[PDB]
From a paper:
Human islet amyloid polypeptide (IAPP) is a 37-residue polypeptide hormone that is co-secreted with insulin from pancreatic β cells and plays an essential role in glycemic regulation. IAPP forms amyloid deposits in the pancreas of >90% of individuals with T2D.43–45 A single genetic mutation resulting in a serine to glycine substitution at residue 20 (IAPP-S20G) is associated with familial, early-onset T2D.46,47 Recently, cryo-EM structures of IAPP amyloid fibrils assembled in vitro for the wild-type (WT)48–50 sequence and IAPP-S20G48 have been determined, as well as those of patient-seeded WT IAPP. Here, we used cryo-EM to determine structures of amyloid fibrils at different times during in vitro fibrillation of a disease-related variant of human islet amyloid polypeptide (IAPP-S20G). Strikingly, the fibrils formed in the lag, growth, and plateau phases have different structures, with new forms appearing and others disappearing as fibrillation proceeds.
The fibrils present after 6 weeks, which represents the growth phase of fibril formation, are strikingly different to those observed at the 3-week time point. More surprisingly, and in marked contrast to the single structure solvable to high resolution at 3 weeks, six distinct fibril polymorphs could be identified at this time point. However, four fibril structures could be solved to high resolution (3.1–3.4 Å). Larger fibril assemblies accumulate as assembly progresses, both in terms of the average repeating crossover length of fibrils and the average number of subunits per layer of the fibril, i.e., the number of proto-filaments in each fibril form. For example, 36% of the dataset shows 4PF fibril structures in the 22-week plateau sample compared with 11% and 0% in the 6-week growth and 3-week lag phase samples, respectively. Importantly, however, because there is a shift toward fibrils with a higher mass per unit length as assembly progresses, the larger 4PF forms have a greater total calculated stability per layer of the fibril compared with the 3PF and 2PF forms. First, we provide a molecular mechanism by which larger fibril assemblies could be formed, by accretion of subunits that dock against the preformed surfaces of their predecessors.
Residue numbers in the entry:
A (entry chain I), B (entry chain E), C (entry chain A), D (entry chain M), E (entry chain Q), F (entry chain C), ...: 11 to 37
Write the structure that this text describes.
Amino acid sequence: RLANFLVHSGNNFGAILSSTNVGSNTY
Amino acid sequence: RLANFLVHSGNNFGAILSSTNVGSNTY
Amino acid sequence: RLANFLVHSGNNFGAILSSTNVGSNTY
Amino acid sequence: RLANFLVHSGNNFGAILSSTNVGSNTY
Amino acid sequence: RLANFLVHSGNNFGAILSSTNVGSNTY
Amino acid sequence: RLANFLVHSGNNFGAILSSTNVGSNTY
Amino acid sequence: RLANFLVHSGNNFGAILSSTNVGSNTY
Amino acid sequence: RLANFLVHSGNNFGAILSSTNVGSNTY
Amino acid sequence: RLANFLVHSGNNFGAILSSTNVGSNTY
Amino acid sequence: RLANFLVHSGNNFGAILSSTNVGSNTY
Amino acid sequence: RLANFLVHSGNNFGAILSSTNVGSNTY
Amino acid sequence: RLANFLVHSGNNFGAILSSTNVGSNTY
Amino acid sequence: RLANFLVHSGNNFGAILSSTNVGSNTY
Amino acid sequence: RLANFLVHSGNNFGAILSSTNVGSNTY
Amino acid sequence: RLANFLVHSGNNFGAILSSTNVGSNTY
Amino acid sequence: RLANFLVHSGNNFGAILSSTNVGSNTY
Amino acid sequence: RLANFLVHSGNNFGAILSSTNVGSNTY
Amino acid sequence: RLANFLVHSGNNFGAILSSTNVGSNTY
Amino acid sequence: RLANFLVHSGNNFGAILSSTNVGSNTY
Amino acid sequence: RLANFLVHSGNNFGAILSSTNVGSNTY
C-alpha cells in the first residue's frame, strides 16, 4: 500500500520569463 | 494498492513568456 | 488496483505568450 | 506501507528569469 | 511503515535569475 | 453573509476539491 | 461576515483541498 | 469579521490543505 | 475582527497545511 | 483585532503547518 | 518658434497587466 | 528657437505588472 | 537657442513589478 | 546657446520590483 | 555656449528591489 | 543579402527615425 | 550578408535614431 | 558576414544614436 | 566575421552613441 | 573573427560612446 502525494496549494508566481519546469509536478 | 496524487489548487500565475512546463502535472 | 489523479483546480493564468506545456496534464 | 509527501503551500515567487526547476516537485 | 515529508510553507522568493533547483523538492 | 462549508464524514480514497470565487476580479 | 469552515470527521486516505477568493483582485 | 477555521477530529492518512485570499491584491 | 483557527483532535498520519492571505498585496 | 490560534490535542505522527499574511506587502 | 517632439519608435512590450500610463505621450 | 526632443527607440519591455509611468514621455 | 535631448535607445527591461517611473522621460 | 543631453543607450535591467525612478531621465 | 552631457551606456542591472533613483539622470 | 541604409545630407531641425524588423519573432 | 550603414554628411540640429532587429527573438 | 558602420562627416549639434540586434534573444 | 566600425571625421558638438548586440542572450 | 574599431579624426567637443555585446549572456 503505497501513496504518493505531490501537491501545489496557494502558490503565487508573479512573472515567469524564459524558464523551464516552474511550479510543476513530475513523477 | 497504489494511489498517486498530483494536484494543483489555487495557484496564481501572473505572466508566462517563452516558458516550458509551467504549472503542469507529468506522470 | 491503481488510481492516478492529475487535477487542476482554481488556477489563474494572467497571460501566456510563446509558451509550451502550460497548466497541462500529461500521462 | 510507504507514504511520500511533496507539498508546496503559500509560497510567493516575485520574478523568475532564465531559470530551471523553480518551485517544483520531482519524484 | 516509512513516511517521508518534504514540505515548503510560507516561503517568499523576491527574484530568481539564471538559477537552478530553487525552492524545490526532489525525491 | 457568506458561508463556505466543506464537510467530509465518510471514508475517502479519492480527491475532493472545492473552489469558490465571490465578488472578485479574477483573470 | 465571512465564515470559511473545513470539517473532517471520517477516515481520509486521499487529498482534500479548499480554495477561496473573496472580494480580491487576483491574476 | 473574518473567521477561518480548520477542524480535524478523525484519523487522517492523507493531505488536507486550505488556502484563503480575503480582500487582497494577489498575482 | 479576523479569527484564524486550526484545530486537530484526532490521530494524524499525514500532512495538514493552512495558508491565509487577508487584506495584503502579494505576488 | 487579529487572533491567530493553532491548537493540537490529539496524537500527531505527521506535519501540521500554518502560514498567515495579514495587511502585508509580500513578494 | 518652438517645436516639441514626443516620439515612440520600434518599442516592444511583451505583456502589460494592471498598469497605467505605459508607453504613452502626455503633453 | 527652442527644440525639445523626447524619444523612445528600440526598447524592449518583457513584463509590466501593477506599474505606473513606464516607458512614457511627459512634458 | 536652447535644445533639450531626452533619449532612450536600445534599452532592455526584463521584468517590472509594482514599480513607478521606470525608463521614462519627464520634462 | 544651451544644449542639454540626457541619454540612455544599451542598458540592460534584469528585474525591477517595487522600485521608483529607475533608468529614467528627469529635467 | 554651455553643453551638459548625462550619459548611460552599456550598463547592466541584475536586480533592483525597493530602491529609488537607480541608474537615472537628473538635471 | 540585407542592406539597411539611412542617409542624411541636408539640414535637419527635426527628428528622423528608422525601425526595421527582418526575419524576427517580435512581440 | 548583413550591412547596416548610417551616414550623415549635412548639418544636424535634431535627433537621428536607427533601430534594427535581424533574425532575433525579441520581446 | 555582419558589417555595422556609423559614419559622420558633417557638423553635428544634435544626437545620433544607432541600436542593432542581430541573431540574439533579447527581452 | 563581424565588423563594427564607428567613424567620425567632422566637428561634433553633440552626442554620438552606438549599441550592438550580436548572437547574445540579453535581458 | 571579430573586429571592433572606433576611429576619430576630427575635432570633438561632445561625447562619443560605443557599446558592444558579442556572444555573451548579459542581464
